[PDB]
């Protein structure tokens, strides 16, 4: 449960690595993060798994070949703002939601 | 591809396989379903995918050994009602939330 389990992993992404540095004014990057890890019993209470996930995790144990294990996905994300030049050189500030993952869980 | 992408799949679960053999009156099972399928371009943040999943997909394509692809998970879940018996022969109707997967997306 603790060690190998489903949880938020740190990931900072820079627009320079994506190849968008020439037109993005601010910021030059951000903490995006991502989810990863095993989704099997025991299911830590902090991730608040749903009734469906508990049933899937159990059914997966009985029929390993006909039902996959649930997947580690975001339970909470934060929006972010970006200031950039469009193709017509206009300066735009846009708010992008669901960009930063704060918490993960088995769904 | 049309049907190899992230989507909902049919899956029926019998209460007997869970152990509700003598306390359940009806139903005897239900269609829990499940999400499965690969997450990759093409993606739409305004429909089933999120902005975060798009960014994660791009980072994965550049360092596939460091960051995994986003995963296919539920975007919509429905409840189910059951009629059952207690120790005093009382007939009880109970609603269980988030038991049925209706739609899936890349998260």
Locate A25 and state its tokens.
């004014």
Comparing CB atoms, the residue among A34, A71, A98 nearest residue B73 is: A71
B13 contacts A50? CB cut-off 8 A:
no
Which residues, other chains included, contact B66 with Cβ-Cβ below 8 Å and sequence gap of 6+? Answer: none
> Could you give the dihedral angle defined by the CA atoms of residues A24, A28, A30 and A32, in that order, rounded to the nearest 10 degrees?
50
**Which residues on chain B are in Cβ contact (under 8 Å) with A97?**
51
Give the resolution in Å. Answer: 2.1
CATH 3.40.50.300 fits A1-107, yes or no: no
Measured in angstroms, the CA of B91 and the nearest CA of chain A are apart by 23
**Which residues on chain A are in Cβ contact (under 8 Å) with B67?**
11, 34
Task: Report whether B104 contacts B35 (CB < 8 A).
Answer: yes
For chain B, breaks with the C atom over 2.5 A from the next N come after: none
Locate A35 and state its tokens.
């989810």
**Which residues on chain B are in Cβ contact (under 8 Å) with A32?**
52, 55-56, 59
What is the C-alpha separation between B53 and B62, in angstroms, rounded? 15
**Surface of A (50-89) touching B: CB under 8 A:** 50-52, 55-56, 58-59, 62, 67-68, 70-74, 77
Comparing CB atoms, the residue among A32, A62, A96 nearest residue B17 is: A62
């Amino acid at each position: 449960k603790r060690l190998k389990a489903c949880r938020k992993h740190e990931l900072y992404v820079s627009f320079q690595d994506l190849g968008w540095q020439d037109w993005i004014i601010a910021p030059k990057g951000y903490a995006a993060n991502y989810c990863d890890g095993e989704c099997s019993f025991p299911l830590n209470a902090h991730m608040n798994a749903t009734n469906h996930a508990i049933v899937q995790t159990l059914v997966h144990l009985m029929n390993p070949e006909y039902v996959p294990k649930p997947c580690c996905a975001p339970t909470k994300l934060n929006a972010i703002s970006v200031l950039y030049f469009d193709d017509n050189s206009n300066v735009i500030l846009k708010k992008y939601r669901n960009m930063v993952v704060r918490a993960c869980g088995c769904h």
